């Protein structure tokens, strides 16, 4: 109650976002749940006069993504009320997801943790792409004949590379060949393995981030 | 060796007390094993109150040492399911014999040691758990604006997106809720890549926090080694 | 897979038993197939015995070292397919040719890095154990009161609530039981993403335990260069 | 911008979607002849590709450039192969020689080879394992689950089947234990999968981590 300032608006916020969009609503709670979002709005546009009018911060700074928060949080549902007529107007109150990111940490150091591994995460991304036209590839020569509605397309195939690979698994999709199953397994496995190579790369790229505080602060000693 | 033999004394009477109330809630249950099971519970009650007093009789240890959460694990341990058995009439008195859940944690270390390192990490921990918040919402939103129209039964309210969304995100995926539309399957690909990503941010900053943990004690190793 | 094929003999032996034990199983086999699968196994079991005898004869290496577990598995991979063999007049007897699965274990260099790994994180590893237990149950135990007047054959004890527990806080999920109420999705919801928050613990015990292993590979830079 | 300057993993993507492309089913004669004709321009950038890297020899004295060259070889002579040879329309799968492309002029994989070469024998050993406990597991679903379900469990590879389903953490449904006994190994079997999990993980993890005390080392020198 001290800190989570907009991030606590948000909540009731985008919960009532998503409470307009439940079919069979009461036109009091329909109203209830809009007169809902009015105040959270209008609670983001004294906050937007907070940051805009009162400018006691210092002298060397930058607000550029702060601000850009703030103004959008207002302007979008705004727009929705003036511009869009049907029902589908209260979604655009779902810019206050950007509520929550404005005045959290650990985003900065997500960015540089991304910044110092986009390197290795493009990569391992590609290496799951090649993987996954592969995988639904060889899938489609293998069942296409068995399931033509099912494997009948490498996108179709694909659609199961995905849902495996990823370690997912809905299970509208199942090879019926053993030739095709033991693809199944293999593609289950080496899924195991990119899940591990993401997780290898992100703790490498977060240990660098205190490795950069450790030599920061080591070097500050002298 | 040891793992095995110093934890197990407090925490195994859990073990059979927690499985004597999953018993409890099977149906058609013989009076004989009916009773039996109770009677198990009321022993391990017991069990627990010569427990509560051990570390209420005994006064003298060392100098200074923290008893506060081992001792309130110990109380909850036999006030909860006595108070239990007298207020409530109903069979349903004994699912608050989980209250025994308590005891194999604080009993063993790991978490004091998982404690400090949630601590020491809670700025990213909090933050991914965010991060997993808008992104499970801002797709749920996508989901629901592709396929509201095509299969109206689920997709048919953000909360109905939001539901396929966690099952699709955490890569559990049930199976009653699969997009239809190729737009909207192209982007239940990239929720199911992004899930991996959140696997592995989760198991970046727990890597980070573990390994702090180890290094911290160096501080301790600096000061007096040998 | 160039330079394994005269490396681990001992172990490329037990693909091809497995294998057969596997193959052993599928119903509506011809008979001399069926012959043929057990003569492959009698013959992977002789190259055992020939196995054994080269180890236990022969005893001229070097005078201080210790390979208890290398000869249990080799003890076990001839008595206990023989036992079977003799003892069992079921089909079933070629079941137990699966001791083989340990001959991979035999020669790898991983398992003893694996078991100091395991034995420098015990304390851990059992506390995420627990853990898992832990909310698996109380996890369950909500999911019993909410589900239970609902979905009466699918929620109706807690054992039925923690079959959905651990088919949704691993993560696996079939889909043979989902709470159908909004208070139990909500639920369901936190119990997947609790599940992502024990994934990212067992990976993170274990990349420390692993991490101390390359400290522990500080004995051949400290006192020899 | 930068990495994306180089055409070589950029024609790749409309090139691959191409391939995916003509195994639709019910496409208009007119997209069938122009996605062929797309893949030709394609195949005819890559031959110009590989006419640079093979008449190019003045950059450097000494050095290697063998699998960029076998990318480049491979890329014109797959295809050109089912140019020739393949009648049936299953000649455009050969394109799929270009999922080696994205691969060839990207950073990552130079860095993802010595890191899988460093744990080499740790990663085998966790293969190994896998599959060691996948049979175990499998072996004892099938003695408690093949009575009651035939079609299911009635044999070792049928249970194995389950196993990589369940240990992978996949599970799709098409299989389900149904005996309180086979259904606590279920779950045993979906706890090890969490662990094994992390041992992909941790391997990995500690592979890039030795891969940064080398760039410690090369920070050191230079
Ligand atoms: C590399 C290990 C993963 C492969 C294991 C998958 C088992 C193959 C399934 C065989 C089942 C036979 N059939 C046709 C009845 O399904
Ligand atoms: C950006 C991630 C890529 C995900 C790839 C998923 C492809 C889905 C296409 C399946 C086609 C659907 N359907 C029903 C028309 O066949
Ligand atoms: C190691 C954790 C695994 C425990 C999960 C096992 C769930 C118990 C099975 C309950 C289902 C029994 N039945 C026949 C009543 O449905
Ligand atoms: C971790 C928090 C996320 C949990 C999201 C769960 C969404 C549940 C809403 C599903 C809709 C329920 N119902 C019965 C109305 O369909
Ligand atoms: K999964
Ligand atoms: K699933
Ligand atoms: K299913
Ligand atoms: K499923
Ligand atoms: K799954």
Same mark, same amino acid.
Not at 49 to 56: D, G, I
Not at 151 to 162: D, K, L, R
Not at 177 to 189: I, T, Y
């Given at each position: 109650i001290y800190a989570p300032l907009n991030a606590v608006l948000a909540a009731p916020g985008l919960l009532a976002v998503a409470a307009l969009t439940?079919?069979?609503?009461?036109? !009091?709670?329909?109203?209830?749940?809009?007169?809902?979002?009015?105040?959270?709005?209008?609670?983001?546009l004294l906050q937007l006069?907070?940051?805009?009018?009162?400018? !006691?911060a210092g002298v060397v700074r930058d607000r550029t993504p702060k601000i850009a928060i703030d103004v959008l949080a207002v302007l979008v549902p705004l727009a929705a009320f003036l511009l869009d007529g049907s029902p589908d107007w209260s979604?655009?109150?779902?810019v206050w997801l950007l509520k929550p990111l404005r005045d959290?940490?650990?985003?900065?150091?997500?960015?540089?943790?991304?910044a110092n591994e986009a390197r290795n995460l493009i990569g391992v991304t590609t290496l799951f792409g090649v993987v996954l036209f592969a995988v639904a590839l060889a899938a489609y020569v293998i069942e296409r004949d068995i399931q033509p509605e099912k494997?009948?397309?490498?996108?179709?195939?694909?659609?199961?590379?995905?849902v495996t690979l990823s370690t997912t698994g809905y299970g509208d999709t199942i090879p019926q060949?053993?030739?095709?199953?033991?693809?199944?397994?293999?593609?289950?496995?080496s899924g195991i393995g990119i899940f591990g190579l993401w997780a290898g790369i992100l703790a490498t790229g977060f240990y660098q981030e205190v490795r950069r505080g450790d030599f920061v602060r080591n070097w500050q000693l002298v």
């Open positions: 439940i079919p069979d609503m009461s036109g !009091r709670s329909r109203l209830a749940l809009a007169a809902l979002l009015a105040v959270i709005w209008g609670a983001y006069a907070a940051t805009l009018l009162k400018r !006691r979604l655009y109150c779902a959290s940490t650990f985003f900065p150091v997500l960015g540089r943790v991304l494997f009948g397309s490498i996108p179709q195939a694909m659609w199961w590379a995905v060949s053993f030739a095709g199953r033991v693809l199944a397994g293999a593609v289950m496995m």
